[model samples]
Target chain A: AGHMDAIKKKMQMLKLDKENALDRAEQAEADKKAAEERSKQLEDDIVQLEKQLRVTEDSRDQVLEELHKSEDSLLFAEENAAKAESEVASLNRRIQLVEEE
Target chain B: AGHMDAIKKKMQMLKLDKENALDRAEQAEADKKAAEERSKQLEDDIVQLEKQLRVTEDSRDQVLEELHKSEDSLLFAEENAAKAESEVASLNRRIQLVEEE
Candidate 1:
């Protein structure tokens, strides 16, 4: 009877450990899911940033085009003014020659 | 002696179980820590994603604003052209009347 009592106690302890193991396993699973969800959320955020970068790049390109056009117009105006000045000088020289004649 | 032998055997088994329980407890603790670390990493990922979302939203807002501005500029240019055409037509009419006079 004493030996049987010892056996019973051992079995009780084993049962307790089994219960604990079950709880731990459940907890581990829960943690795993939580971690996965967090990683997924971060991935989503990174994707959004990438999309934003694309749009910003597009806008920068458009602004650059406008800047280039403005520069071209300025250069064209400068060239036209220079040509007119040269013509004016030539005409003045002709006028002086005609007057002298 | 038989009773004592029974007690010794019981003690031996109890000791073995005690050792097993210790190993299991250690394993449980390790599992708990692992779960904690996983959860922490997941939290970090979620924060990263939230930041990314904010950035994407900002980009979207900027793009939308730019689109609206472009539309407004186009409309303004159209109106200006229409006004200029009307003015030219009115001036031409005056010129014709004076010439007829």
Candidate 2:
């Protein structure tokens, strides 16, 4: 009878250990799934941010090109102004000579 | 003697089941750890990408401001050119009238 009781107690302990281990395994599986989901979210955020960076860079390039064009326009206008000023000076000298006649 | 043999056999089975459960639990724990590490790496990548996005946006804004300033400069230069053109026309008219007198 004593031997039977010891064997029964040993079986009980084994069953409890198995139950605890299974519970731990189930909890660990759940933890893994949650972490994987978080990883997917972070990955999506990275994709969006990279796309935004590319768009901003393209916009910057366009603005720089526009600035370059505007600089060229300013230079052309300044040259035109200088030419007109010289013509005005020459015409003023001609008027002075004609009036003195 | 038969009862003792049956008890021993049952104990052996319980031990085997317990060992298998422990092994599964350990493997699950390792998987969870690996998934968490991946989450951390992805989070870091997101951080870096967001930083890059902000820097790109700032650069774009700076370029846009420069374009605005260039446009203003071009407009001022064009106005100066127009004024010089008017002055030249007026002086030519004066020279023509004075020479005819």
Candidate 3:
């Protein structure tokens, strides 16, 4: 009778462990799905953010090019203005000397 | 005898199930860790990318301002050159008139 009772108790414990294992497996499956979802979402976000960064970088390049072109024209205009001013001064002196004669 | 054999078979099945459960648990733990590590790396990447985007945007803004100033100066310089050209033309006409006298 004692041996039979011990076997029955062990069988019951085995059944309990089996049930617990099944429950944990189900929960683990759910946890894995959730984790993968978040990982996938993060990957998607990275792509979009990288594109945004590229856009700003491209915009900055365009603006820099425009700025450089403007600088070149501005310098040329200043030089031309200075030459015109000097020529005007020389001509004024010529006119004054001609009158004195 | 058959009853004892059935109990033995049941015990064996229970052990197998318990081993499988442990394997699944360990695999779930490792998967969880991998997912978390990837998630952490993505978060760090986002921070760096965001900062980089901000830098490019700020650079674009500064370039825009510089371009605006350069354009204004170019126009202003061109106007001054035009004034000088008109004045020189007028002076040449005056010299011609004096020669005619």
TM-score of each: 0.47, 0.49, 0.46
In the range B15-99, model 3's lDDT, one tens digit per residue, is 5655555555555445545555554555565566567777766665655565455445545545554554555455555545544
Ranking of candidates on TM-score, top first = 2, 1, 3
Residue B58 error, candidate 3, Å: 14
DockQ of each candidate's interface versus the true one? 0.01, 0.01, 0.01
Scanning candidate 3 chain B in windows of ten residues, the lowest lDDT window is B92-101
Local distance difference test values of all predictions, in order: 0.55, 0.55, 0.55
Please give the distance, in angstroms, between residue B4's alpha carbon in candidate 3 and its true position after superposition: 99
State candidate 1's TM-score: 0.47
As for candidate 2, its clashing pairs are: none
Which segments of model 2 are wrong by more than 4 Å? A1-101
On residues A1-101, what C-alpha lDDT tens digit does candidate 2 reach at each position?
57656656655665565555555555544554554555455556556656777776666565556545544554554555455455545555554554444
lDDT: worst 10-residue window of model 1 chain B: B92-101
Error of 1 at A63 (Å): 37
**Model 1 misplacement above 4 A:** A1-101
Residue-level lDDT of model 3, residues A25-65, one tens digit each, is: 45544554554555455455555556766886676565556
Error of 1 at B36 (Å): 0.8
